[PDB]
Design a protein around this nucleic acid. Structure first.
Lengths: 73, 310, 184, 89
RNA sequence: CCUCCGAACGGUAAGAGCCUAGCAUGUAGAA
């Protein structure tokens, strides 16, 4: 179970444990649990690149400790 | 191949002492403006249309499939009709033996392009007292567009006053490359001709594949068997290699060409026979009236005029 | 500005009516092509013209937040603020369904609880099929009664947070609305 | 004296010159330069969306003798629009 | 048995160049 930091630089910096087999939807659900924003209202970016919900975390190579930029929809 | 007066002082010193370094094509110096409109996205992915001028993805490819490159290759095609590699097939007088006219074949070979399939209905009555000497009267070609393997022609068969005295010997088609067998497209075309045209008789039908050989042409006479003809007519797999083909579907034909009989040539009365450059007319409902005229250039000014609009 | 609220408008729910759409989605609408091409200088006459050409309803879709034309027209009316009876003419139309649902959504965002119930409960009797675009861009076949049920029961419709409706039984116990007489 | 803003009844030819390459020399004017040109504004913009921002801007509409005020249509106008489309189809 | 899970900053290329914004105001004197 890898651990990903999902950071909003204004301030929402959150720490989320997740599986590698998890899709981005499951990670968004965990971020929703730990932030209060609804999971379908959360965008995970890499400086401009939007991670898509149907792709597993292993495919994106989101490894244990990596930061993901938190944006909203 | 240099100029001795153009040599500099150090150039002469290097010539006398040792040698000089060359420069291969693999050595690349990757170390006016043409605006281009491209459908891109912005940084946020908003699907915009931009007009750029930086020459960094502008290298044109233009290889083997361009109208300009194909036309340049078609240039000097008349000089490639010298070594006419005829095919001595094993046709032991099955029906009317192939006695074709040399002038008509020479004109047809030099008037076709080696990019798409160019074909034509070669029909003609047999000569006087022809027991095993079929008559290669002339080839009539209507507007059509051809693929890399088989050429699509108009649905309606030819019907002309000069064709009243001529019987349909078969259909000639020039393949892109050489192949020691009838292609699935050729078999499908033969089956369609036999099913639709009553003049495409079983033993009376032929296929003069005037393919493009290496350096010269390759004229192979072939015929379709009854069962093979039925299979090629019902074969819905119209690709380069369909499923449902057997070696018995086609057989060779023993024939030759001579210049004694000056054959005719059916040209289009309305538009040019080679209509591949304009693919908005080669449809199945084509009912055109042919005429007694020579075939037009494969890339003539009227064969594909749409490129000249720019 | 093409997106400023008209300067002869009310303040619906205490705020600028355009603010009834979430700010992120408001901005995403503002930078869309449909809002800049097909939603400029529109009056309440031409909102009808664009509305009859709608082929689906929905909010936003894709990894990028791309508004649908339906949501863009909703925001355009929130900007224009057409009169109430114009919206009743929108809803009372029976031939073009998407115009009716567009008017119903505007009424839901804008009208009070009495207006919302009184004007949208008659639409439970409409069972015409409709296209609705998912978040992934796909299209699903819903029904007009299901859309009205989402308007009157769900917090979020077309990815818009809706103004909070008073529950029906509170207005019923206040005599302001007679019980919901169905078609059965 | 500024008239009210009117909705454009014509479609915009944003997609018209895709692939159509323009050779740009010194002597070429801005009219035939790459991108989009506001003949009313005499300005060049190199995005479709940025050109849309321009033709939806205060300065472009000012050059047309317009304003940022939209006509308030009435009941009968909307009703007659409904009947007009009903008749047309 | 062991449960204390922190954060922000030290992360701006400098230019050119054209377009539209948010802004965000604009309510006072007078003949």
């Amino acid at each position: 179970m890898i651990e990903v930091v999902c950071n909003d630089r204004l301030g929402k910096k959150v720490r989320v444990k997740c599986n590698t087999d998890d899709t981005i939807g499951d990670l968004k659900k965990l971020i929703a649990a730990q932030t209060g924003t609804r999971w379908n209202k959360i965008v995970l970016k890499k400086w401009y690149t939007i991670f898509k919900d149907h792709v597993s975390l292993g495919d994106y190579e989101i490894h244990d400790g990596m930061n993901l930029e938190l944006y909203y929809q | 191949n240099v100029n001795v007066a153009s040599l500099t002082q150090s150039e002469i010193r290097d010539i006398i002492l040792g040698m000089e370094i060359s420069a291969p094509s693999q050595q690349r110096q990757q170390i006016q403006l043409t605006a281009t409109q491209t459908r891109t996205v912005n940084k946020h992915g908003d699907e915009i249309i931009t007009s750029t001028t930086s020459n960094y993805e502008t290298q044109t490819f233009s290889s083997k499939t361009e109208w300009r490159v194909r036309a340049i290759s078609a240039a000097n095609l008349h000089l490639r009709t010298n070594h006419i590699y005829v095919s001595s097939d094993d046709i032991k007088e099955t029906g009317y033996t192939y006695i074709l006219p040399k002038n008509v074949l020479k004109k047809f070979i030099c008037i076709s392009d080696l990019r798409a399939q160019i074909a034509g209905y070669l029909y003609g009555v047999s000569p006087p007292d022809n027991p095993q000497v079929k008559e290669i009267r002339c080839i009539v070609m209507v507007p059509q567009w051809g693929t890399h393997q088989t050429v699509h022609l108009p649905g309606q068969l030819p019907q002309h006053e000069y064709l009243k005295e001529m019987e349909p010997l078969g259909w000639i088609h020039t393949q892109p490359n050489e192949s020691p067998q009838l292609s699935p497209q050729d078999v499908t075309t033969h089956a369609k001709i036999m099913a639709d045209n009553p003049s495409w008789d079983g033993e009376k039908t032929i296929i003069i594949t005037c393919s493009f050989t290496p350096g010269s042409c390759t004229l192979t006479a072939y015929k379709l068997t009854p069962s093979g003809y039925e299979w090629g007519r019902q074969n819905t797999d119209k690709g380069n290699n369909p499923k449902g083909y057997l070696p018995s579907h086609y057989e060779r034909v023993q024939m030759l060409l001579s210049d004694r009989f000056l054959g005719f040539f059916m040209v289009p009365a309305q538009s040019s026979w080679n209509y591949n450059f304009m693919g908005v007319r080669h449809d199945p409902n084509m009912k055109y009236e042919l005429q007694l005229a020579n075939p037009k250039e494969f890339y003539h000014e009227v064969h594909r005029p749409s490129h000249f609009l720019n | 500005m093409a997106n400023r609220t008209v300067k002869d408008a009310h303040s619906i729910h205490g705020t600028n009516p355009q603010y009834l759409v979430e700010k992120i989605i408001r901005t995403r609408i503002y930078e869309s092509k449909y809002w800049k091409e097909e939603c400029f200088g529109l009056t309440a006459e031409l909102v009808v013209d664009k509305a009859m050409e709608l082929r689906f309803v929905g909010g936003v879709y894709g990894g990028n937040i791309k508004p649908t034309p339906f949501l863009c027209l909703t925001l355009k009316m929130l900007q224009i603020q057409p009169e109430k009876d114009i919206i009743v003419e929108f809803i009372k139309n029976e031939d073009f369904k998407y115009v009716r649902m567009l008017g119903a959504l505007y009424m839901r965002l804008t009208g009070t609880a009495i207006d919302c119930y009184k004007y949208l409960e008659p639409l439970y009797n409409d069972y015409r099929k409709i296209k609705s675009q998912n978040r992934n861009g796909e299209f699903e076949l819903m029904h007009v009664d299901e859309f009205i049920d989402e308007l009157l029961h769900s917090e979020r419709v077309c990815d818009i947070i809706l103004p909070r409706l008073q529950k029906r039984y509170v207005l019923e116990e206040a005599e302001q609305l007679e019980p919901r007489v169905s078609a059965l | 004296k500024r008239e009210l803003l009117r909705h454009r009844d014509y479609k915009v030819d944003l997609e018209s010159k895709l692939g159509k390459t323009i050779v740009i020399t010194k002597t070429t004017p801005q009219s035939e330069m790459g991108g989009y040109y506001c003949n009313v504004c005499d300005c060049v913009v190199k995005d479709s969306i940025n050109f849309l921002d321009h033709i939806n801007g205060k300065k472009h509409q000012r050059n047309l003798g317009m304003s940022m005020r939209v006509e308030r249509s009435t009941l009968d106008q909307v009703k007659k629009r409904f009947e007009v489309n009903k008749k047309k189809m």
